[PDB]
Each structure stands twice: as C-alpha cells, then as structure tokens.
Design an enzyme around this catalytic site. Structure first.
Site, PDB file in Angstrom:
ATOM      1  N   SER A  10      -6.789 -76.379  -8.300  1.00  0.00           N
ATOM      2  CA  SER A  10      -5.965 -77.557  -8.416  1.00  0.00           C
ATOM      3  C   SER A  10      -6.160 -78.335  -9.663  1.00  0.00           C
ATOM      4  O   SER A  10      -5.247 -79.082 -10.004  1.00  0.00           O
ATOM      5  CB  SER A  10      -6.101 -78.516  -7.232  1.00  0.00           C
ATOM      6  OG  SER A  10      -7.468 -78.974  -7.141  1.00  0.00           O
ATOM      7  N   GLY A  47      -6.695 -75.204  -4.220  1.00  0.00           N
ATOM      8  CA  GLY A  47      -7.608 -74.764  -3.176  1.00  0.00           C
ATOM      9  C   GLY A  47      -8.206 -73.386  -3.433  1.00  0.00           C
ATOM     10  O   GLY A  47      -8.985 -72.900  -2.622  1.00  0.00           O
ATOM     11  N   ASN A  76     -14.065 -75.339  -5.578  1.00  0.00           N
ATOM     12  CA  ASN A  76     -13.823 -75.298  -4.130  1.00  0.00           C
ATOM     13  C   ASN A  76     -14.968 -74.659  -3.391  1.00  0.00           C
ATOM     14  O   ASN A  76     -15.341 -75.164  -2.315  1.00  0.00           O
ATOM     15  CB  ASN A  76     -12.442 -74.714  -3.835  1.00  0.00           C
ATOM     16  CG  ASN A  76     -11.357 -75.657  -4.302  1.00  0.00           C
ATOM     17  OD1 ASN A  76     -11.410 -76.873  -4.037  1.00  0.00           O
ATOM     18  ND2 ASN A  76     -10.402 -75.118  -5.001  1.00  0.00           N
ATOM     19  N   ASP A 157      -7.278 -90.279  -4.305  1.00  0.00           N
ATOM     20  CA  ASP A 157      -8.307 -89.475  -3.621  1.00  0.00           C
ATOM     21  C   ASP A 157      -9.628 -89.260  -4.365  1.00  0.00           C
ATOM     22  O   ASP A 157     -10.537 -88.617  -3.837  1.00  0.00           O
ATOM     23  CB  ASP A 157      -7.750 -88.114  -3.170  1.00  0.00           C
ATOM     24  CG  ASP A 157      -7.480 -87.159  -4.333  1.00  0.00           C
ATOM     25  OD1 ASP A 157      -7.846 -87.471  -5.489  1.00  0.00           O
ATOM     26  OD2 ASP A 157      -6.870 -86.093  -4.079  1.00  0.00           O
ATOM     27  N   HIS A 160      -8.719 -85.501  -7.698  1.00  0.00           N
ATOM     28  CA  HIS A 160      -7.777 -84.851  -8.594  1.00  0.00           C
ATOM     29  C   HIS A 160      -7.380 -85.793  -9.722  1.00  0.00           C
ATOM     30  O   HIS A 160      -7.059 -86.947  -9.469  1.00  0.00           O
ATOM     31  CB  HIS A 160      -6.545 -84.436  -7.818  1.00  0.00           C
ATOM     32  CG  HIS A 160      -6.839 -83.502  -6.687  1.00  0.00           C
ATOM     33  ND1 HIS A 160      -6.923 -83.922  -5.376  1.00  0.00           N
ATOM     34  CD2 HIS A 160      -7.083 -82.170  -6.671  1.00  0.00           C
ATOM     35  CE1 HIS A 160      -7.213 -82.891  -4.601  1.00  0.00           C
ATOM     36  NE2 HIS A 160      -7.311 -81.814  -5.361  1.00  0.00           N
TER      37      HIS A 160
END
Length: 183
Positions: A10, A47, A76, A157, A160
């Site tokens: 991502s 992801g 991840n 969040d 990101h």
C-alpha cells in the site's frame, strides 16, 4: 531500457488516493518531462506480504520482462508479527527469481513500529541488509522515514501517507533510483 517493475504494497499502490495522485505516477510524470528513458510498471497491491508477492512474481516477470525490479515489501509481514526468518526466505526467493530473469534487483529497507517490541523491529529491519549481502540486491533507503513523523503528510489512520506526501516520496524515489542506476 530502464524498465522497473515496482513490487510494493500500500505504500506504493496509492491507498486511499486516486492512482494518478500516487508517487509512482507522479514520478513517471517527472521522467516524461525530463527526457528520461525510465519506465515504471506498478505491480503494488495493498496488504501484500512477502509470501503473496512470491506467488505472483513469476507471472509478472514473464509478462513484462523488466530489466529492473524494485521490491518494497515486508511491512505487512512485520505489522502482523510474522517470523522474520520466513520473511527473509521469501524476500530472498523474490530477489533470486528476479535475478534469474536477468533483472537488476533492489530491495527497500523497511522500518516498523515496536508492536512486537524493539528487538523484533531490529530483527526485521536488519534482515534487509542480510538479504542484500546474500544476493547482492541493491538496498534502498525507506522513503517513509522522513514522512511518518509529519502529521500533515499522513492519513487519519497514521499508517498510510496522504496526497501531500506523494510529491515528497516522488522526489526521494527519483534520487534513490538515480543512485541505483548509476550504482
């Protein structure tokens, strides 16, 4: 011919943004405006893990026959606390498959928060240096280091980067790619 397959997650797939706002597309715009022959092929998937990418790479190498592969994977795996030894096995196989297909290969160093303690974070980040020693893959600086502490560059969040971060990441990647291809 400097065709670079970007095998990312991502952080390179424009998560939460339009694809055209992401640093990969902004970097191609920069190349296009400066008489470069570099072409980026974005194969990043939000992801993605080291093991998921390993399942996709043979097909991508056949598809595009890139001259260069730039791996930006492992965050991840580390966010999930997966064993670093297995991530290292997976990333080494990714590098070796790329090299066997005649692609010059780079691996980005990744850093993670100490969600499983500082020692696991050090085991995780140091594994990228060990893979580079094992394979001769070119190590790249993590572009998030100078981004993640700036709240105006991060999405709600805190994971990101946001749209404002993308031109900054484009410029760090322009410089890292240039140093690699002169390296």
């Amino acid at each position: 011919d400097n065709t670079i397959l970007i095998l990312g997650d991502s952080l390179s797939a424009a998560y939460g943004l339009q694809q055209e706002e992401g640093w990969v597309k902004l970097l191609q715009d920069k190349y296009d405006a400066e008489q470069s022959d570099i072409v980026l092929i974005n194969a990043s998937i939000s992801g993605e893990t080291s093991g998921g990418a390993l399942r996709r790479l043979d097909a991508l190498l056949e598809q595009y026959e890139p001259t260069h592969v730039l791996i930006e994977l492992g965050a991840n795996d580390g966010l999930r606390g997966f064993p670093v030894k297995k991530m290292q096995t997976n990333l080494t196989a990714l590098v070796k498959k790329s090299q066997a297909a005649n692609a010059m290969t780079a691996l980005m160093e990744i850093y993670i928060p100490p969600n499983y303690g500082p020692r696991y974070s050090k085991m995780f980040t140091s594994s990228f240096t060990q893979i580079s020693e094992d394979t001769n893959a070119h190590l790249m600086n993590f572009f998030m280091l100078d981004i993640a502490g700036k709240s105006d560059l991060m999405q709600n969040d805190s994971l990101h980067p946001n749209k404002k971060a993308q031109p900054l990441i484009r410029d760090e990647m322009y410089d890292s790619i240039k140093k690699w291809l002169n390296n």
